[PDB]
RNA sequence: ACAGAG
DNA sequence: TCCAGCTCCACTTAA
DNA sequence: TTAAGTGGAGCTGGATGCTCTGT
C-alpha cells in the first residue's frame, strides 16, 4: 500500500533502480524487486505458450 | 576572376591524383607535386585552358592488381548533368574496355541522372563527386584518422582472433564521404587508426554496411 | 592455456561468498574450524581466507567457450 | 544530506545473497571514490577541517 | 532599491533550482535505458545485449575511471618513487649510477610477468626511468661525484640517492597497480557512463 | 484534487 | 509548451 | 504535350522529476 496512514511501505523507483545496475548487483535487485513484494507462480502450457 | 578559377582546376586535379594514388593506382612523383605557377604550363589561363576534356585523366592503370583495370576521371562544364552527357561519357568508356570513371560535377546532378548510376550496370561503375568535396582533400583534415582498407586475409584473422562474425562488427555507410574517396563497397572492412592523448594509437574496425 | 584475468573479481567474489553463506546457512559441512561465529557470511569470509572454498567459477566468453577456473587459484585481493 | 529535517530510506535485505552483494559491493568502504573522475567523497567536512 | 534588485538577482537562483529537477531528470532517464545494456566482457570488449560490439576494448587502454591516480592516468611516477624510498630506504645499499639504474631497470623489465602489461605502459616506465637517470649524471656532474663510491665527504650521495632495492620495489608496486587497475569482467559499465553525465 | 517537506 | 514522420502539392527534366 | 521523381509546406501525435505527509 500507498504509505504511513496505510502501512505501506517504500517504492524502489526507477532511479535507485539504475543505481543498483552500476554495481553490478544482480541478486539484490531481484530480491527487492521480486521476492520482498510480488512473488508468484503461473501454470505455463509449454504447448500453446 | 581567372585567377580563382584556375586555382580550383589545380586544387581539385591535386586531390584526384592523391584519391587515385590512395587507391592504389599508379602515379607519378611529378603529378602529387605539380605546383601552381607550374599548372599555368600545360594549361593557361581560361581563354586558352579547356575545362570538358583537356584535364581528363586515363593514364590511371591499377598497377597493383593489373594495368588493364583502367579508370576514368571526368570534368563536366554543365553545372547540372543530364542523362545524355552521362550517356556520352559511357559509350566513351565502353569503346576504351574501361570499367570505373569519376564525374566531377560543378554544381549538381539531375535526379533522372543519379538513378542511372546505380543501374547503368554493375560492370560500369561510376561516382558523383561534387567538386565542392575535392577542394579539400578529407583525408589530411585533423578530425579524420587513417583509414586503411583491410585484405580478405586479414578480415578473417581479425574475425578469428575475436571469434565474431561479419554482422557484429561496427558498421560504415557507403554514403560516408571517407568511403566514397577511398571507393568501398559492401563487405569491405576498413581499419581505423585512431590517435590517443598519448603517444600511442587505438585500433578500430568497422564494415561497410 | 587460459587466456582471462588471473585475478578475482568483485562480482566473483560477491557472488562466491553469496552462494557459500546460503549453503552454510544450510546444513553444509564448513571447511575451516569456526570459533564461535554465527553470522553465515562471516564464515564464508574465512573459507575464502584460507582458500577452502568448493567452488568452481565457469567464466564465458560472448561466443559460449568457457574456462574452469578454482576459487582457491585465482588472486584475490580487496 | 544536510540534517535540517531530512528524511532517508531503509532497506533490509532479506537473502543470504543479497547479503554478500549488498556488503561486499555497495559498502561503503568499497566506495570511497566516485566512479566519474576517481576523486574521494567520503572525506572530512566542516568542524573536522577547522 | 538596493534591496530589491538583490532580490531579483536572488530568485533566479531559486528558480533554477525549481527548474533543474525536470530540467535533468528526463535527461538522465533518456541515457540509462539507452547505455544499461553494455557490459564489459571476458574477452576485453564491450557489447550490447545482442551481442554487437561497440568499442573492441574498453576506452582504449581497458582501465578503470574510479582507479586513477592521475588525470586520467593509472599512476603518477613521481610520487609512487617518492614513497618507495621513504617506505624503504636502504642505508646499507650502495647508490646506483646512471649506467648501473638502466642496466638494473632492463634486468627486472624482461622478466617474464611484465610481459602481460600493455607495451605502451612499459615505455612510460622505461621513459621515467631515463629521465630519473639523467638526473643522476646532472647532480654526480656538478658536484664530482665518482660512481665508484670512493669520494669522501659521504653526504652526497644522498643528493639523487637510488638503490637496487628500491628500483625493484618501484616497478613490482607500478606493475600491481596497472594490473588492478584495469576495468573488471562483468561491470555494468553503460550505467556508470549514464550517471557520471547525468549528474 | 490541492497544500506541504527534503 | 517544443519536435520528428506522413501526406499533399507545385516544379523542373525527359521522352 | 505529359510521366515521373523530388523539392517545400502543413497536419498529426508524442513527450515534459523524484518521493512521503496530510485533508
Ligand atoms: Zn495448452
Not at chain 1, 19 to 27: K, N, P, W
Not at chain 2, 151 to 157: A, G, I, L
Not at chain 3, 13 to 39: H, K, N, S, W, Y
Not at chain 4, 16 to 28: D, F, N, P, Q
Request: negative net charge; aromatic residues 6%.
Amino acid at each position: 500500500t500507498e504509505g504511513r496512514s496505510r502501512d505501506g511501505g517504500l517504492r524502489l523507483g526507477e532511479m535507485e533502480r539504475d543505481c543498483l545496475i552500476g554495481y553490478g548487483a544482480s541478486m539484490l535487485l531481484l530480491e527487492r524487486l521480486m521476492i520482498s513484494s510480488d512473488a508468484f507462480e503461473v501454470d505455463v502450457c509449454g504447448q500453446c505458450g | 576572376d581567372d585567377e580563382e578559377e584556375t586555382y580550383r582546376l589545380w586544387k581539385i586535379r591535386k586531390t584526384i591524383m592523391q584519391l587515385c594514388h590512395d587507391r592504389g593506382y599508379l602515379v607519378t612523383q611529378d603529378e602529387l607535386d605539380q605546383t601552381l605557377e607550374e599548372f599555368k604550363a600545360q594549361s593557361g589561363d581560361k581563354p586558352s585552358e579547356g575545362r570538358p576534356r583537356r584535364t581528363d585523366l586515363t593514364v590511371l592503370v591499377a598497377h597493383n592488381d593489373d594495368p588493364t583495370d583502367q579508370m576514368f576521371v571526368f570534368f563536366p562544364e554543365e553545372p547540372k548533368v543530364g542523362i545524355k552527357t552521362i550517356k556520352v561519357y559511357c559509350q566513351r568508356m565502353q569503346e576504351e574496355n574501361i570499367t570505373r570513371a569519376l564525374i566531377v560535377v560543378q554544381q549538381g546532378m539531375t535526379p533522372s541522372a543519379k538513378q542511372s548510376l546505380v543501374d547503368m550496370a554493375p560492370k560500369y561503375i561510376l561516382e558523383q563527386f561534387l567538386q565542392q568535396e575535392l577542394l579539400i582533400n578529407i583525408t589530411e583534415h585533423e578530425l579524420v584518422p587513417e583509414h586503411v582498407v583491410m585484405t580478405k586475409e586479414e578480415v578473417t584473422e581479425l574475425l578469428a582472433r575475436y571469434k565474431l562474425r561479419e554482422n557484429q562488427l561496427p558498421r560504415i555507410q557507403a554514403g560516408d564521404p571517407v568511403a566514397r574517396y577511398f571507393g568501398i563497397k559492401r563487405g569491405q572492412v576498413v581499419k581505423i587508426i585512431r590517435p590517443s592523448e598519448t603517444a600511442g594509437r587505438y585500433i578500430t574496425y568497422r564494415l561497410v554496411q | 592455456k587460459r587466456i582471462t584475468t588471473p585475478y578475482m573479481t568483485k562480482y566473483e567474489r560477491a557472488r562466491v561468498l553469496g552462494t557459500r553463506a546460503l549453503q552454510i546457512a544450510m546444513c553444509a559441512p564448513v571447511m575451516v574450524e569456526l570459533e564461535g561465529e554465527t553470522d553465515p557470511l562471516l564464515i564464508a569470509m574465512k573459507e575464502l581466507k584460507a582458500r577452502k572454498i568448493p567452488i568452481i567459477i565457469r567464466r564465458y566468453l560472448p561466443d559460449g567457450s568457457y574456462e574452469d577456473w578454482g576459487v582457491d587459484e585465482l588472486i584475490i585481493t580487496d | 544530506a544536510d540534517f535540517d529535517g531530512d528524511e532517508m530510506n531503509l532497506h533490509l535485505p532479506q537473502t543470504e545473497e543479497a547479503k554478500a552483494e549488498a556488503l561486499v559491493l555497495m559498502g561503503t568502504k568499497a566506495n570511497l571514490v566516485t566512479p566519474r573522475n576517481g576523486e574521494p567523497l567520503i572525506a572530512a567536512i566542516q568542524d573536522f577541517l577547522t | 532599491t538596493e534591496f530589491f534588485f538583490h532580490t531579483m538577482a536572488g530568485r533566479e537562483g531559486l528558480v533554477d533550482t525549481a527548474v533543474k529537477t525536470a530540467e535533468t531528470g528526463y535527461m538522465q532517464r533518456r541515457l540509462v535505458k539507452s547505455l544499461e545494456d553494455l557490459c564489459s566482457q571476458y574477452d576485453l570488449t564491450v557489447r550490447s545485449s545482442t551481442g554487437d560490439i561497440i568499442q573492441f576494448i574498453y576506452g582504449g587502454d581497458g582501465l578503470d575511471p574510479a582507479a586513477m591516480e592521475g588525470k586520467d592516468e593509472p599512476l603518477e611516477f613521481k610520487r609512487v618513487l617518492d614513497n618507495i624510498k621513504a617506505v624503504f630506504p636502504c642505508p646499507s645499499e650502495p647508490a646506483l649510477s646512471k649506467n648501473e639504474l638502466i642496466l638494473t631497470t632492463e634486468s627486472i623489465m624482461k622478466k617474464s610477468e611484465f610481459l602481460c602489461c600493455q607495451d605502451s605502459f612499459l615505455q612510460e616506465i622505461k621513459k621515467f626511468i631515463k629521465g630519473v637517470s639523467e638526473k643522476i649524471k646532472k647532480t654526480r656532474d656538478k658536484y664530482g661525484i665518482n660512481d665508484n663510491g670512493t669520494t669522501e665527504p659521504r653526504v652526497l650521495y644522498q643528493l639523487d640517492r637510488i638503490t637496487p632495492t628500491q628500483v625493484e620495489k618501484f616497478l613490482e608496486t607500478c606493475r600491481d597497480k596497472y594490473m588492478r587497475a584495469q576495468m573488471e569482467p562483468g561491470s555494468a559499465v553503460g550505467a556508470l557512463c549514464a550517471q557520471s553525465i547525468g549528474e
